[PDB]
Structure 1
Amino acid sequence: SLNSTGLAQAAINGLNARFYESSNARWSSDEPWWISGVALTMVIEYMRRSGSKEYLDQVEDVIEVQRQPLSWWPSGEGEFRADATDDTGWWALAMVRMYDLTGNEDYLNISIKDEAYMRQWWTDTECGGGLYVDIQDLTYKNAIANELYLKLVASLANRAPNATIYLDRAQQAWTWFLGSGMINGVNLINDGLARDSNTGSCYNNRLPVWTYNQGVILGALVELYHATKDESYLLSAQAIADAVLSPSNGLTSSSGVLTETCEGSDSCNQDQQVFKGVFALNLAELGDAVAGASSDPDAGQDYREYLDTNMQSMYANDRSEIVPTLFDSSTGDLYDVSWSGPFRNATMPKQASAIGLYVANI
Structure 2
Amino acid sequence: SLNSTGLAQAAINGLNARFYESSNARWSSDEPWWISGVALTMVIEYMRRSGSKEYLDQVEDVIEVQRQPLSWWPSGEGEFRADATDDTGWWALAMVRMYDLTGNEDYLNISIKDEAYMRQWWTDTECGGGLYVDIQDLTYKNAIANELYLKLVASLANRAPNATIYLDRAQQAWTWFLGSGMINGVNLINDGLARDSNTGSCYNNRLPVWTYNQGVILGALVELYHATKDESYLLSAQAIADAVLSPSNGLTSSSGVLTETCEGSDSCNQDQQVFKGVFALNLAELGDAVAGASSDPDAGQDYREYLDTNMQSMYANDRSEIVPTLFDSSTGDLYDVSWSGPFRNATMPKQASAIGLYVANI
Fold conserved between structures, TM > 0.5: yes
2:298 aligned with 1:317, yes or no? no
- CA drift of 1:73 comes to 0.2
1:353 positional shift:
0.1
What is the DSSP-based 3-state SS (H/G/I as helix, E as strand, rest coil) of the residue aligned with 2:326? coil
Q: Deviations over 1:281-337 (max 9, x none)?
A: 000000000000000000000000000000000000000000000000000000000
> Segments of 4+ in structure 1 off by > 6 A?
none
Matched-pair identity in %? 100
Partner Cα distance (1:245, 1:349) in 2: 23
SS at 1:17 equivalent:
helix
Quote the Cα distance in structure 2 between the aligned partners of 1:92 and 1:337: 25
CA distances 1:50-91 after superposition (whole Å, capped 9, x unpaired): 000000000000000001000000000000000000000000
Distance 1:259 1:346 in 2: 17
Provide the rounded CA distance (Å) in 2 between the counterparts of 1:89 and 1:42.
Answer: 15
**Superposition deviation, residue 151 in structure 1:** 0.1
Tell me the alpha carbon deviations over residues 125-167 of structure 1, each in whole angstroms, 9 at most, x when there is no partner: 0000000000000000000000000000000000001100000
Q: Deviations over 1:106-131 (max 9, x none)?
A: 00000000000000000000000000
1:2, CA displacement in angstroms?
Answer: 0.7
Separation in structure 1 between the aligned mates of residue 217 and residue 83 of structure 2, nearest angstrom: 23
**1:190-230 alpha-carbon deviations (Å, 9 max, x no partner):** 00000000000000000000000000000000000000000
Task: Tell me how far 1:25 sits from its aligned partner.
Answer: 0.2
> Secondary structure in 1 aligned to 2:334?
strand
**Deviation digits for residues 24-70 of structure 1 (CA, Å, limit 9, x no counterpart):** 00000000000000000000000000000000000000000001000
- CA offset at residue 238 of structure 1? 0.1
The CA distance in 2 between the partners of 1:199 and 1:139, in whole Å, is: 16
Give the Å deviation of 1:252: 0.2
Offset of residue 169 of structure 1: 0.1
Instruction: Indicate whether 1:288 and 2:280 are aligned.
Output: no
Q: How many residues align?
A: 362
Q: Measure the CA separation in 2 of the matches of 1:192 and 1:154.
A: 21
Q: What is the alpha-carbon distance in structure 1 between the residues aligned to residue 93 and residue 75 of structure 2?
A: 21
How far apart in 2 are the matches of 1:313 and 1:30? Answer: 29
Q: Distance in 2 between matches of 1:47 and 1:248?
A: 36
The one-character-per-residue Cα deviations of 1:252-295 (angstroms, maximum 9, x if unpaired) are 00000000000000000000000000000000000000000000
1:57-68 mapped onto 2 (5 Å cutoff): 57-68=57-68
Q: Deviations over 1:161-185 (max 9, x none)?
A: 1100000000000000000000000
Structure 1 segment 263-282 matched on structure 2, within 5 A: 263-282=263-282
Q: Partners of 2:95 and 2:274 in 1: how far apart?
A: 19
Matches within 5 A, 1:186-335: 186-335=186-335
Secondary structure of the 1:157 match is helix
Aligned partners of 1:58 and 1:188: how far apart in 2? Answer: 37
1:241 to partner: Cα distance: 0.2
In 1, the alpha carbon distance for the partners of 2:221 and 2:22 equals 37
TM superposition shift of 1:5: 0.1
How big is the shift at 1:245? 0.4
Deviation at residue 100 of structure 1 after TM alignment: 0.2
Cα distance in 2 between the residues matched to 1:321 and 1:31 = 22
Report the Cα distance in structure 2 between the residues aligned to 1:188 and 1:58, rounded to whole angstroms. Answer: 37
The equivalent residue for 1:126 is 126
Partner of 2:157: 157
What is the CA-CA distance between 1:240 and the residue it aligns to? Answer: 0.2
Supply the distance in 1 between the matched residues of 2:113 and 2:152 (Cα, whole angstroms): 11
SS in 2 for 1:188: coil
Structure 1: segments with no counterpart, 5+ residues: none
Distance (Å, rounded) in 2 between the aligned partners of 1:351 and 1:325: 21
Structure 1 CA distance for aligned equivalents of residues 344 and 350 of structure 2: 12
Measure the CA separation in 2 of the matches of 1:266 and 1:234. Answer: 34
Equivalents in 1 of 2:340, 2:225: separation in Å? Answer: 34
- Structure 2: gaps of 5 or more residues: none
CA distance in 1, matches of 2:228, 2:301: 24
Residue 320 of structure 2 aligns to a residue whose secondary structure is strand
Alpha-carbon RMSD across the aligned residues, in angstroms, is 0.2
